[PDB]
Design a binder for this molecule. Structure first.
Ligand SMILES: O=c1[nH]c2sccc2c2cc(O)ccc12
Lengths: 192, 198
């Protein structure tokens, strides 16, 4: 369980509200305000989910071996409705719950995830967006109807890309197709 | 730390090992199969050694063993497959997104049978162009389960007022389970592949 996490009194899940103006809060706030400076942050919470973290770190170690080094991780955004926040905190992102495939979608820019279509305002005008560690690894352009990423070579049809995107040269979204390829690290509660 | 009975894979992450009749390992699987599939004949039984699937499954098992109260969370179950799906399952395991709709649906997930006879149906273990049928023997994390329902995309909550605290799997009948449905990756490890014929 990582350093920057705070003690959980032998619990396996907790949401920890960050202290405004300390380094961790400022770092996450800056990633958001890069594209969402007109939105007001009410709070940022650190998601401390020991089981999801363990499963994600195992997939990371595997992808690091498979891809032979490489930076396989990106920090991306995911807007969700308030009704899905308890499920995601506890269980992460579930493809079963889609222009570039039937997976979970993550945005490069908070502004994309800040659309009311993704971060639906609740009865109080509050919107919710995760900052997500995503194992994007080696990626290719996606297409409608994919249930997994395409093969890297159709001569070896089981050796797959790790994720797909809208644009390989200048990506703005990534889609992953497997559980435990995405770890929800922070939850931003904000208003337009 | 892979199991010590596995063949040395000499840095490789994946291997199928052909078992020898007369070995306890072959005989236990043959017996489990023939209990309900005495009319079919086994061509061969291969042990599936998939390091990454094993690691991810064992992490999930350790988590369910912690979460549940001294429960036997693991059952050894059957899964019939078409020949076209065998390479993908061997490497990547069981993907709910690829699953057929079952004739009796208890949810949208991967189905595992208690009896080899269920999986031996041509609808599940489709005979290939050479008349070979394929069935996996699978370690499945059934955990704490309840009767499923066709609408499910995740197992249902144990308690309607705590929607995120889920059953581990669902079944057709809690009193006499004959099938189990799982809704998450790395909840099922394909351990053996039985190749068999009429
Ligand atoms: O942030 C997103 N949340 C959601 S919820 C379901 C779809 C999406 C989505 C799709 C994208 O292409 C890019 C971002 C997001």
């Amino acid at each position: 369980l990582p350093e920057h996490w705070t003690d959980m009194n032998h619990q396996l899940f907790c949401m920890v509200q960050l202290e405004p103006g300390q380094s961790e809060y400022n770092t996450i706030k800056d990633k958001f305000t890069r594209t969402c400076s007109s939105y007001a942050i009410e709070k940022i919470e650190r998601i401390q989910n020991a089981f999801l973290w363990q499963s994600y770190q195992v997939k990371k170690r595997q992808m690091d071996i498979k891809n032979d080094h490489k930076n396989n991780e990106r920090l991306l955004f995911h807007g969700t409705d308030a009704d899905s926040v308890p499920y995601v905190n506890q269980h992460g992102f579930n493809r079963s719950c889609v222009s570039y495939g039937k997976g979970t979608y993550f945005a490069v820019d908070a502004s994309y995830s800040a659309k009311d279509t993704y971060s639906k305002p609740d009865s109080n005008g509050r919107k919710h967006m995760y900052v997500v560690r995503v194992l994007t690894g080696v990626f290719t352009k996606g297409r409608a109807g994919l249930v997994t990423p395409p093969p890297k070579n159709p001569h070896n049809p089981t050796d797959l890309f790790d994720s797909v995107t809208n644009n390989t040269r200048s990506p703005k979204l990534f889609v992953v197709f497997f559980d435990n390829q995405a770890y929800p690290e922070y939850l931003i509660t904000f208003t337009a």
